[PDB]
């Protein structure tokens, strides 16, 4: 059956290893496992590409389909069609939601970490960016917009969230939606959330929760964006989509997207509908991997003596504190170690480092060792 | 290699569902119903049995081919510096328009035309200066030094189309040059447009790269090409574009993070795979193609009120219908069973584009439709 304890050799064209190409540095940075695709996925695309030809296609009715099926029944958030935007990755469509709902006068809103494109966006785009610092509370990075009322000025314009958050992992809890909600709504702000992580909640009894989901009010003032590209790792062919419930702020969307971003490959699509279609068995038996290697990590991490790290709600990051060191530069110092972390001060934090755990449990002990080794000592 | 195959597509082919349900022949968008080359369908299945999809390099292999084909095919080295690859050709002209005009600039092309040559402006603000194509000696032929004192001055991007795409027009040496000096007479940065350059079907005439002229040019130009028309994987739409200018390069990447995503990493082995193996592929489908234009050509003339130029570049197809005193040309073959390109779309809207991309049996009942309809539907 499922076999995730699988090494594959690349000796590919992942540019997760060749950026430590010819050097003794294990790659755990950019977030994408080394699993191989469900074998539903695999087939489907074998099916697409003997067919033989591959023009202009038209959108995936298919996915559309699968896709509001998943979001009732595993979110309880029933989707109505025309709300569906398809894009090719999600990074776009956060940049095309800054260029649509918020003008050069206006500013965003996000946490710090979070993903470098939310306001990496705003700075290609023109315009600034507040950013709300992330608190640890309860061995959880927990968000508190209203406790950043008065470092507003009234020029914010558009809420960037992410649900679950990259890089710390934390999977908000329904009263801390609300509490973001109600943060929207008393400065009206447009809220765009990055839901990539939802199908990797590791915690039992926790369900992931749209924040459009919440009220008519939220749906009506937000897009969320979702994709299976991590889920089931496949991020290189990039099959995302966005959900605006609202008619105008859909308007305003596709008149930004159109021929600035093209459409969504022919086969993207093929692999996006068997991923959400048949491929949940596949996730099922991922989710336990990647539970029994993150339990791993995180109690290896504490054990050594300058490292703290929270146990991510949702896989496969992997927020490590290394402030504790007091090197000038973490991320570098383990390279030199033949450890290859995300650097931390991409994300709007230098003394962190990202760990990507989505890897056969063979290769997270090797790099355990490293670290053990390179910590003790002494360096 | 075989081209008469008749293919069912009840798929996710635009071509084909836009009349699914109806008893007309699609013969509107600009891809065939060819079947791709063995060489790139082995390539994908070979990528897709690896089974890891994630995150992929630029593919270094597609930049090597890509450099020896401008060479062999074109006469023009291009540096590995100087290659952008896109997802798809529309993405590229809208990133042209944007990084090298301004809101008070306009940009100059000729009609008719590909439609995204005069949307894109259109929907980014930008004023647009349209030149109109006239007939000399059977060709549709580009007189732009005849608009001179119609321009105002705000003029600064210059949209190249070589081959066109209605017109199916191969310029000249003479011809392109005359271009040049317009855009260096008035400024002009240059976007050509070159995506259908492997579909020349004139025997002893070669494609000739504007960028290719000079260095002035190459230093003002940006040249966009990609395998998806020639060898119909446009569905995948790994496109390239090159930019000799460092500045130029430095606006047009500025202006595309973020918002334009990297190329896939399935159409990254498909656009390898065919420009590296593909030719004698595409070699057959040129033949098939003259074969087939020459048959439509032949019989768009016999018709009574139609008239057409022979294309120089697969696989359009620009029919004048002006001599049939209806309204809507294209709603009016629509209705006999004919799917066409209404002209409207591309600023003319007495005319049909027939897309003789398809299996010569097929055509054949395509042209069967035209006579019942003309002989006489009026
Ligand atoms: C990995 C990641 C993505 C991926 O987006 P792509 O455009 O498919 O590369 C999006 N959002 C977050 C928060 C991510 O971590
Ligand atoms: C068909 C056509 C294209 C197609 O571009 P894609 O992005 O590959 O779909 C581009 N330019 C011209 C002139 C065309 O006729």
Not at 103 to 112: F, G, L, P, Y
Not at 189 to 205: A, Q, Y
Request: glycine content about 6%; overall charge neutral; hydrophobic content about 40%.
């Amino acid at each position: 059956f499922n076999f995730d304890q699988r090494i594959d050799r690349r000796h590919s064209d992942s540019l997760k290893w060749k950026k430590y190409a010819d050097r003794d540095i294990l790659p755990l940075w950019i977030a994408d496992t080394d699993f191989r695709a469900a074998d539903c996925i695999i087939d489907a695309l074998q099916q697409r590409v003997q067919q033989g030809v591959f023009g202009y296609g038209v959108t995936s009715e298919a996915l559309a389909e699968v896709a509001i099926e998943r979001m009732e029944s595993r979110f309880g958030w029933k989707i109505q069609p025309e709300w569906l935007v398809f894009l090719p990755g999600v990074v776009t469509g956060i940049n095309i939601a800054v260029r649509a709902f918020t003008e050069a006068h206006q500013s965003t809103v996000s946490a710090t970490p979070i993903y470098p494109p939310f306001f990496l966006a705003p700075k290609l785009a023109g315009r600034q960016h507040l950013s709300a610092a992330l608190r640890l509370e309860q061995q959880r990075w927990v968000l508190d917009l209203d406790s950043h009322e008065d470092r507003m000025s009234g020029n914010e314009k558009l809420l960037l969230l992410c649900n679950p958050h990259n890089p710390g992992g934390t999977v908000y809890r329904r009263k801390e939606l609300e509490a973001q909600l109600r943060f929207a709504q008393r400065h009206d702000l447009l809220v765009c959330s990055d839901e990539i992580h939802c199908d990797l909640v590791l915690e039992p009894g926790v369900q992931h929760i749209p924040f459009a989901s919440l009220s008519d009010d939220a749906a009506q003032r937000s897009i969320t964006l979702m994709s299976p590209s991590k889920s089931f790792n496949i991020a290189g062919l990039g099959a995302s989509l966005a959900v605006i419930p609202n008619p105008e702020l859909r308007a305003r969307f596709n008149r930004m997207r159109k021929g600035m971003v093209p459409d969504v490959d022919v086969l993207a699509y093929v692999a996006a509908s068997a991923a959400w279609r048949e491929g949940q068995p596949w996730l099922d038996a991922q989710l336990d991997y990647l539970r029994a290697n993150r339990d791993m990590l995180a109690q290896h991490v504490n054990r050594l003596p300058g490292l703290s790290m929270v146990t991510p709600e949702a896989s496969f990051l992997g927020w490590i504190d290394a402030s504790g060191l007091g090197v000038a530069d973490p991320a570098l110092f383990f390279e030199k170690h033949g450890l290859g972390f995300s650097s931390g001060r991409d994300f709007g934090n230098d003394r962190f480092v990202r760990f990507n755990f989505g890897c056969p449990r063979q290769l997270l002990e090797e790099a355990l060792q490293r670290m053990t080794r390179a910590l003790t000592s002494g360096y």
